[PDB]
Design an enzyme around this catalytic site. Structure first.
Site, PDB file in Angstrom:
ATOM      1  N   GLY A 143       1.792  21.456   3.572  1.00  0.00           N
ATOM      2  CA  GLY A 143       2.459  22.524   4.280  1.00  0.00           C
ATOM      3  C   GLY A 143       1.756  23.904   4.291  1.00  0.00           C
ATOM      4  CE1 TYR A 168       8.486  23.103   8.080  1.00  0.00           C
ATOM      5  CE2 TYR A 168      10.320  22.718   6.617  1.00  0.00           C
ATOM      6  CZ  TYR A 168       9.054  23.209   6.814  1.00  0.00           C
ATOM      7  OH  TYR A 168       8.403  23.787   5.695  1.00  0.00           O
ATOM      8  CG  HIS A 206      10.605  31.814   2.359  1.00  0.00           C
ATOM      9  ND1 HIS A 206      11.584  31.555   3.294  1.00  0.00           N
ATOM     10  CD2 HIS A 206       9.447  31.353   2.878  1.00  0.00           C
ATOM     11  CE1 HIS A 206      11.038  30.978   4.340  1.00  0.00           C
ATOM     12  NE2 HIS A 206       9.729  30.868   4.119  1.00  0.00           N
ATOM     13  CD  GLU A 241       5.569  31.284   4.957  1.00  0.00           C
ATOM     14  OE1 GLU A 241       6.672  31.682   5.309  1.00  0.00           O
ATOM     15  OE2 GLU A 241       5.292  30.084   4.738  1.00  0.00           O
ATOM     16  CG  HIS A 263      10.363  34.072   7.237  1.00  0.00           C
ATOM     17  ND1 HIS A 263       9.280  34.504   6.504  1.00  0.00           N
ATOM     18  CD2 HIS A 263      10.242  32.733   7.326  1.00  0.00           C
ATOM     19  CE1 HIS A 263       8.546  33.465   6.146  1.00  0.00           C
ATOM     20  NE2 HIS A 263       9.123  32.368   6.614  1.00  0.00           N
ATOM     21  CB  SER A 294       5.648  25.688  10.179  1.00  0.00           C
ATOM     22  OG  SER A 294       6.074  25.392   8.868  1.00  0.00           O
TER      23      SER A 294
HETATM   24  O1  LIG Z   1      11.790  25.927   9.765  1.00  0.00           O
HETATM   25  C1  LIG Z   1      12.033  26.154   8.552  1.00  0.00           C
HETATM   26  O2  LIG Z   1      12.786  25.495   7.762  1.00  0.00           O
HETATM   27  C2  LIG Z   1      11.433  27.407   7.954  1.00  0.00           C
HETATM   28  N1  LIG Z   1      10.180  27.841   8.510  1.00  0.00           N
HETATM   29  C3  LIG Z   1       9.543  28.816   7.912  1.00  0.00           C
HETATM   30  O3  LIG Z   1       9.994  29.351   6.907  1.00  0.00           O
HETATM   31  C4  LIG Z   1       8.164  29.299   8.453  1.00  0.00           C
HETATM   32  O4  LIG Z   1       7.661  28.794   9.475  1.00  0.00           O
HETATM   33  O5  LIG Z   1       7.612  30.203   7.788  1.00  0.00           O
HETATM   34 NI    NI Z   2       8.449  30.661   5.961  1.00  0.00          NI
END
Ligand SMILES: O=C(O)CNC(=O)C(=O)O
Ligand code: NI
Ligand SMILES: [Zn+2]
Length: 346
Positions: A162, A169, A180, A182, A268, A280
């Site tokens: 990741g 997801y 959080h 990253e 975020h 991601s």
């Molecule tokens: O989609 C998710 O569960 C969360 N995605 C993220 O936190 C990201 O892309 O940084």
């Molecule tokens: Ni994230």
């Protein structure tokens, strides 16, 4: 971007093609100040011909998300469920028990999310190793962004799932991602391949610290047991709580076909509206190196992800390598400053 609001960009294919160069661009426009940006790709760009052929992909470790809390403060607990195909996943996502409620405006749906968060635990097909990009997609391929993050695997052979590899997801209604930044305070890229939206909350990096100080007071147990307890990705805080305690934040809804970028130290959180699929991974620019060096990491061993900064400091900051190594490198980060690669557009 003095207000530090979330910006959306609509690049042509000519602008779209070089990924690191477009990131330098949006930072030249102040995008990074929000912590989060939307990039709507050009019409002619698709990462995959069709998604008809994925009914049989295994979600090895689907997670049931149990939420406990009240009055805007919640902790999420993960129960691992047995492996499941995407076909089995979608049946459950769209069934009467788990499907998205009827709503008029997004604010209505957001209301139902914060009201019903602790009820009827959903299952998140989270952290699935893979990509839905076809082999030949050269533009914004999450499997190969070609950023200086590549120096980890190049130098050391180390891949971190990741982080320098892609994660898929599969969401359903009311599945959540907690507050959080990253790992290593990197950038992230999120592409929503198909399905129902994904809503996002973002705190500007310049106010990130105020968010952590507030979360420490809201969950003091957690704070005494770990420096970086938000890195466990179990902590949900409602926008009404943020607003009651003076944390600036913005919100935005991502739709199928749209990219979101998060920036170093950009807190975020969010939730999925219904059945969907996102891809991601993390990435880096030169500006990140200082964030990496300075990242406050999990001290209780729940989050094990740690990147050696040595190769980045040797290559891109050779002056400060011996100082940094002597532990004397007292550089202060300026969150408003765009990455060096942005001089081209400035
Ligand atoms: O989609 C998710 O569960 C969360 N995605 C993220 O936190 C990201 O892309 O940084
Ligand atoms: Ni994230
Ligand atoms: Zn920890």
């Amino acid at each position: 971007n003095p207000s530090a609001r979330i910006m959306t960009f609509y690049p042509t294919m000519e602008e779209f093609r070089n990924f690191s160069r477009y990131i330098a661009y949006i930072e030249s426009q102040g995008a990074h100040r929000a912590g989060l940006a939307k990039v709507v790709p050009p019409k002619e760009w698709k990462p995959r011909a069709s998604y008809d052929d994925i009914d049989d992909l295994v979600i090895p470790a689907p997670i049931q998300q149990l939420v406990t809390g009240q009055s805007g403060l919640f902790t999420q607990y993960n129960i691992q469920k047995k492996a499941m195909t995407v076909r089995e996943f979608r049946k459950i996502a769209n069934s009467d028990k788990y499907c998205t409620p009827r709503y008029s405006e997004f604010e209505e749906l957001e209301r139902k999310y914060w009201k019903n968060l602790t009820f009827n635990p959903p299952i998140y097909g989270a952290d699935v190793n893979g990509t839905l990009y076809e082999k030949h997609v050269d533009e914004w391929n999450i499997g190969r962004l070609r950023t200086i993050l590549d120096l980890v695997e190049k130098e050391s052979g180390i891949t971190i799932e990741g982080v320098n590899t892609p994660y898929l997801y599969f969401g359903m209604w009311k599945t959540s991602f907690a507050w959080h930044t990253e790992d290593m305070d990197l950038y992230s890229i999120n592409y929503l391949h198909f399905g129902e939206p994904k809503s996002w909350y973002s705190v500007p990096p310049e106010h990130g610290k105020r968010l952590e100080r507030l979360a420490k007071g809201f969950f003091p147990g957690s704070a005494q047991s770990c420096e970086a307890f938000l890195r466990h990705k179990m902590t949900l805080i409602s926008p009404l709580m943020l607003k009651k305690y003076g944390i600036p934040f913005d919100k935005v809804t991502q739709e199928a076909g749209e990219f979101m970028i998060t920036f170093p130290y950009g807190y975020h959180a969010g939730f999925n509206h219904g059945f969907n699929c996102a891809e991601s991974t993390n990435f880096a620019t030169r500006r990140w190196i200082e964030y990496g060096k300075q990242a406050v990491l999990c001290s209780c061993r729940k989050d094990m992800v740690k990147i050696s900064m040595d190769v980045f400091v040797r290559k891109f900051q050779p002056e400060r390598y011996k100082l940094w190594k002597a532990g004397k490198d007292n550089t202060v980060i300026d969150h408003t400053l765009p990455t060096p690669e942005a001089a081209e557009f400035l």
